[PDB]
C-alpha cells in the first residue's frame, strides 16, 4: 500500500488549504484514514481521521472549526480541507492508514501506513525579489543577509563562485510578514581584508533576480 | 503541555536510551496506553509500538525487541527503552496518547547517537548594517557553529533583558566539517537598536552557554 499526498504548496492566510490523498495497493473503504501535520522543526498534530467504512468523522477540538475530511471511493482517494488558514498552518501535512488491533478485548488504534508528507506554506505574500545587506567584519567572519525574498529558494555564492573555501550558507527562516530570510558567511585571513575583493552573489530565480553584494570592512 | 518530552538526548553507541514522556498531572499515566513513534530526518515517523502494561502492549511489525516500552509511576511517565544502540537509531521519538476523542502528542525528542567528538558552539553576531539601517530596517545575526551533537537553544536579549518577539531560528543542519551549525535572528525598529546599551545572542549547548553581544 502506498500513500501520496497532493496538493498547492502555498496558501494564503484566510483561505482554504486543500489537499489530497492518493492511496494504491489498497481500499478506502476497508480501512480508517487520518491527516496529522507538522510545522517545521516542531511536533506533530493530530487533524482528524475518518472512516473508510461509515464516512464518520473525529476531528481535533482544537481545529474543529476548520476541519474537514472526505473520501472519494471511485478514484480511491481521500481529502483534507482547512479554512481560514494562518501561520499555524504552515507544515508538512501526512496521510495515515490506520492500523487496529484487539488486545484483551479492547481496540487498539495506531498510525500504521504514511505518506512522504508535503509542505504547505501559509503566506500572504506575492513573488519578491531579495534585499542584500553586507556583513561587515588571524581570520574574519564576513558576509550578507538575504533579506524579504518570495518564494524559496534563492543561491548564494562568492566572488562568482570562485571563493568556496569556508563559506557557510544557512537554511532561510520564514518570518512572520511571510517573507523569507537567510544569510551566508566566509571566513577570510584578516590580511586579505585590505586587498581582496569580497562579493556575495545571490539568485532568485522565481523572481528573475540577480544581486551582487560588494562585502566591505 | 499533556505529554512532556526532553527536546534532545545523546547516547554512545551499544549503550542503552531511557526517553521519557511524562503527563501532566490530571492525566494518571497507569490509564493511558502510551504510543511511541520514530522519525528519521526527511521521512514521515514510524509506528515502534505501545505500551499499557507487561499484559497490554504490542510491538509494531518489523521492529526489534530492543525497543521497548515500560511507565514510571513516580514520574507519571511512559518511557521507550531502546538496548544496543546502533547510528541508524538516530532520530526523533514522538509519545502519543488517546484522551477524549482526541490524539495528543508529545514534542518528541531527538536522540543523538555519539558518532563524533562533543564540540561546543563557535558563535558569531553582526549588528544591523549602515545600509539596512538606512534602509528603516534593523536586523542582528546570530550564526552558530561546530557544535555537536547537533541540538541547541538560543535565547536573545535587549541589555540584561530577555526578548522573544521578532525571534527566527534555523534547525541546526552539518557543515563540510562534519559539525552542526545554525543561525538565529532578532528583528527590530532601528529606533529599538539605537536606544539601547547591547543586545545579546545566547546560545546553550549541553553543559556550555555561549553568549555574544554587539552595540550600538
Known amino acids: 500500500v502506498q500513500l501520496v499526498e497532493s496538493g498547492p504548496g502555498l496558501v494564503k492566510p484566510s483561505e482554504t488549504l486543500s489537499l489530497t490523498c492518493a492511496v494504491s495497493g489498497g481500499s478506502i473503504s476497508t480501512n480508517d484514514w487520518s491527516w496529522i501535520r507538522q510545522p517545521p522543526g516542531k511536533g506533530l498534530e493530530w487533524i482528524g481521521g475518518?472512516?473508510?467504512?461509515?464516512?464518520?468523522?473525529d476531528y481535533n477540538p482544537a481545529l474543529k472549526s476548520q476541519v474537514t475530511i472526505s473520501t472519494d471511493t471511485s478514484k480511491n482517494q481521500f481529502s483534507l480541507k482547512l479554512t481560514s488558514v494562518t501561520a499555524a498552518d504552515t507544515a508538512v501535512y501526512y496521510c495515515?492508514?490506520?492500523?487496529?488491533?484487539?488486545?484483551?478485548?479492547?481496540?487498539?488504534?495506531?498510525?500504521?501506513?504514511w505518506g512522504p508528507g508535503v509542505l504547505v506554506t501559509v503566506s500572504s505574500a506575492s513573488t519578491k525579489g531579495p534585499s542584500v545587506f553586507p556583513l561587515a567584519p588571524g581570520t574574519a567572519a564576513l558576509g550578507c543577509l538575504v533579506k524579504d525574498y518570495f518564494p524559496e529558494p534563492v543561491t548564494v555564492s562568492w566572488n562568482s563562485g570562485a571563493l568556496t573555501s569556508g563559506v557557510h550558507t544557512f537554511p532561510a527562516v520564514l518570518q512572520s510578514s511571510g517573507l523569507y530570510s537567510l544569510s551566508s558567511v566566509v571566513t577570510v585571513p584578516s590580511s586579505s581584508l585590505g586587498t581582496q575583493t569580497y562579493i556575495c552573489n545571490v539568485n532568485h530565480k522565481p523572481s528573475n533576480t540577480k544581486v551582487d553584494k560588494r562585502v566591505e570592512p | 503541555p499533556v505529554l512532556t518530552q526532553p527536546t534532545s538526548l545523546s547516547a554512545s553507541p551499544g549503550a542503552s536510551a531511557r526517553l521519557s514522556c511524562t503527563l501532566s498531572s490530571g492525566f494518571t499515566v497507569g490509564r493511558y496506553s502510551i504510543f511511541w513513534y520514530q522519525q528519521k530526518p526527511g521521512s514521515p515517523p514510524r509506528y515502534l509500538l505501545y505500551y499499557f502494561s507487561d499484559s497490554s502492549q504490542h510491538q509494531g511489525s518489523g521492529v526489534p525487541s530492543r525497543f521497548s516500552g515500560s511507565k514510571d509511576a513516580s514520574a507519571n511517565a511512559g518511557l521507550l527503552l531502546i538496548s544496543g544502540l546502533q547510528s541508524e537509531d538516530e532520530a526523533d521519538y514522538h509519545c502519543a496518547i488517546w484522551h477524549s476523542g482526541a490524539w495528543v502528542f508529545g514534542g518528541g525528542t531527538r536522540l543523538t547517537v555519539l558518532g563524533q567528538p562533543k564540540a561546543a558552539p563557535s558563535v558569531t553576531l553582526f549588528p544591523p548594517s549602515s545600509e539596512e539601517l538606512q534602509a528603516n530596517k534593523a536586523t542582528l545575526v546570530c550564526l552558530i557553529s561546530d557544535f555537536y551533537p547537533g541540538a541547541v537553544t538560543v535565547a536573545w536579549k535587549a541589555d540584561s533583558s530577555p526578548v522573544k518577539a521578532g525571534v527566527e531560528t534555523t534547525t541546526p543542519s552539518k557543515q563540510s566539517n562534519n559539525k552542526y551549525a545554525a543561525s538565529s535572528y532578532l528583528s527590530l525598529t532601528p529606533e529599538q537598536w539605537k536606544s539601547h546599551r547591547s543586545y545579546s545572542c545566547q546560545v546553550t549547548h549541553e553543559g556550555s552557554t555561549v553568549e555574544k553581544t554587539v552595540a550600538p
Open positions: 475518518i472512516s473508510g467504512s461509515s464516512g464518520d468523522t
Open positions: 495515515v492508514r490506520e492500523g487496529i488491533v484487539l488486545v484483551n478485548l479492547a481496540v487498539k488504534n495506531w498510525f500504521d501506513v
